[PDB]
Each structure stands twice: as structure tokens, then as C-alpha cells.
Design an enzyme around this catalytic site. Structure first.
Site, PDB file in Angstrom:
ATOM      1  N   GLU A  35      39.738  33.760  47.729  1.00  0.00           N
ATOM      2  CA  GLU A  35      38.600  34.029  46.858  1.00  0.00           C
ATOM      3  C   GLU A  35      37.363  34.326  47.706  1.00  0.00           C
ATOM      4  O   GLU A  35      36.689  35.334  47.495  1.00  0.00           O
ATOM      5  CB  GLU A  35      38.304  32.830  45.949  1.00  0.00           C
ATOM      6  CG  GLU A  35      39.228  32.677  44.749  1.00  0.00           C
ATOM      7  CD  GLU A  35      39.044  33.778  43.715  1.00  0.00           C
ATOM      8  OE1 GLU A  35      38.005  34.473  43.747  1.00  0.00           O
ATOM      9  OE2 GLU A  35      39.937  33.939  42.857  1.00  0.00           O
ATOM     10  N   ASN A  46      29.527  42.171  40.241  1.00  0.00           N
ATOM     11  CA  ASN A  46      30.522  42.753  39.348  1.00  0.00           C
ATOM     12  C   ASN A  46      29.897  43.821  38.456  1.00  0.00           C
ATOM     13  O   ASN A  46      28.679  43.871  38.293  1.00  0.00           O
ATOM     14  CB  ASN A  46      31.158  41.658  38.492  1.00  0.00           C
ATOM     15  CG  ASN A  46      31.903  40.635  39.325  1.00  0.00           C
ATOM     16  OD1 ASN A  46      31.569  39.449  39.321  1.00  0.00           O
ATOM     17  ND2 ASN A  46      32.917  41.091  40.050  1.00  0.00           N
ATOM     18  N   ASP A  48      29.839  44.078  35.292  1.00  0.00           N
ATOM     19  CA  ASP A  48      29.202  43.570  34.082  1.00  0.00           C
ATOM     20  C   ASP A  48      27.862  42.904  34.357  1.00  0.00           C
ATOM     21  O   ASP A  48      27.258  42.309  33.461  1.00  0.00           O
ATOM     22  CB  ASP A  48      30.141  42.599  33.354  1.00  0.00           C
ATOM     23  CG  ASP A  48      30.398  41.320  34.139  1.00  0.00           C
ATOM     24  OD1 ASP A  48      30.071  41.276  35.343  1.00  0.00           O
ATOM     25  OD2 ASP A  48      30.937  40.360  33.544  1.00  0.00           O
ATOM     26  N   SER A  50      27.407  40.416  36.342  1.00  0.00           N
ATOM     27  CA  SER A  50      27.615  39.042  36.778  1.00  0.00           C
ATOM     28  C   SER A  50      27.842  39.030  38.284  1.00  0.00           C
ATOM     29  O   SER A  50      28.073  40.073  38.899  1.00  0.00           O
ATOM     30  CB  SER A  50      28.833  38.433  36.076  1.00  0.00           C
ATOM     31  OG  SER A  50      30.036  39.025  36.534  1.00  0.00           O
ATOM     32  N   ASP A  52      29.784  36.529  41.478  1.00  0.00           N
ATOM     33  CA  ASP A  52      30.672  35.414  41.806  1.00  0.00           C
ATOM     34  C   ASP A  52      30.003  34.672  42.957  1.00  0.00           C
ATOM     35  O   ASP A  52      29.554  35.298  43.918  1.00  0.00           O
ATOM     36  CB  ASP A  52      32.049  35.923  42.231  1.00  0.00           C
ATOM     37  CG  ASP A  52      32.715  36.754  41.157  1.00  0.00           C
ATOM     38  OD1 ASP A  52      32.814  36.269  40.010  1.00  0.00           O
ATOM     39  OD2 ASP A  52      33.138  37.888  41.460  1.00  0.00           O
ATOM     40  N   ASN A  59      32.074  32.581  38.611  1.00  0.00           N
ATOM     41  CA  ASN A  59      31.326  33.641  37.930  1.00  0.00           C
ATOM     42  C   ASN A  59      30.137  33.235  37.055  1.00  0.00           C
ATOM     43  O   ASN A  59      30.198  32.267  36.296  1.00  0.00           O
ATOM     44  CB  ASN A  59      32.315  34.486  37.116  1.00  0.00           C
ATOM     45  CG  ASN A  59      31.702  35.766  36.594  1.00  0.00           C
ATOM     46  OD1 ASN A  59      31.085  35.783  35.531  1.00  0.00           O
ATOM     47  ND2 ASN A  59      31.860  36.845  37.347  1.00  0.00           N
TER      48      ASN A  59
END
Ligand code: NA
Length: 129
Positions: A35, A46, A48, A50, A52, A59
Site C-alpha cells: 500500500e 485520486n 475523485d 480524495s 490516500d 482514504n
């Protein structure tokens, strides 16, 4: 801070992740490896809007608040900045909430992709736990 697998394993064990919700320590260490590559400061943007955050790439559209993600929830009730600490406490606490009301560790796409069904114990072998 970038953790070595064994130092991270010890920290996750300390914070009670070994067998949390039925997932062995190796699963959690493996998840962190794919990850964030064990990087507590890693962030990823991301499509959208968002982002991480941290060691377990949690997220902002669902779990933490960064104030810049449209249509968020903050289900872990924590500012995303707390997920970027050199100490993994906050990320572990949120991870426990995520794996408890969700679809197990499938919540972490990288774990599903690279860890699920594999010899995750390899991640804790050779360690002094
Ligand atoms: Na959010």
C-alpha cells in the site's frame, strides 16, 4: 519515516493487530508493504478528489477528513494529518474500524492484489518479535 518490515511487525503486534478480526500479523505487514512501501508519509491523489494517507493509505473520501475531498464522511473521526505520524497508532486505530465494519482486509486493494492467499508469514520470518 520508512519502516523496515521487522520494526513495523513489532509495532503492529504492540498495537494489537496480530489476528485482529482473524487476520494474522503477516497480513497487516504485507498490506503496508504494497500500500505504502512501509512509508508513513506517503500520500496518493485520486480522480475523485480524495487522497490516500500514510502507512496503510487510508482514504479521505470515507475515513478521515482533509477538508478538500468532495462528498466525504470521516468515519474514523480523525483529521487525515494524524495518519501521517511517524508513530502508527492513529492509522492502526482507524484500520481496526475499517476491517471491522467492512469486507475484511479486502478494503485494501493492494492487500487483495499482492497479499491475499499468499505466504504472508514470509513478512515476519527472520524477525525478533
Ligand atoms: Na473525508
Amino acid at each position: 519515516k520508512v519502516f523496515g518490515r521487522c520494526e513495523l511487525a513489532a509495532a503492529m503486534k504492540r498495537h494489537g493487530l496480530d489476528n485482529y478480526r482473524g487476520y494474522s500479523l503477516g497480513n497487516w505487514v504485507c498490506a503496508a508493504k504494497f500500500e505504502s512501501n512501509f512509508n508513513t508519509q506517503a500520500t496518493n491523489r485520486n480522480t475523485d478528489g480524495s487522497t490516500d494517507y500514510g502507512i496503510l493509505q487510508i482514504n479521505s473520501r470515507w475515513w478521515c477528513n482533509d477538508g478538500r475531498t468532495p462528498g466525504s464522511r470521516n468515519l474514523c473521526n480523525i483529521p487525515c494529518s494524524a495518519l501521517l505520524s511517524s508513530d502508527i497508532t492513529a492509522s492502526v486505530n482507524c484500520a481496526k474500524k475499517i476491517v471491522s465494519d467492512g469486507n475484511g482486509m479486502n478494503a485494501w486493494v493492494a492487500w487483495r492484489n499482492r497479499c491475499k492467499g499468499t505466504d504472508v508469514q514470509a513478512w515476519i520470518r527472520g524477525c525478533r518479535l
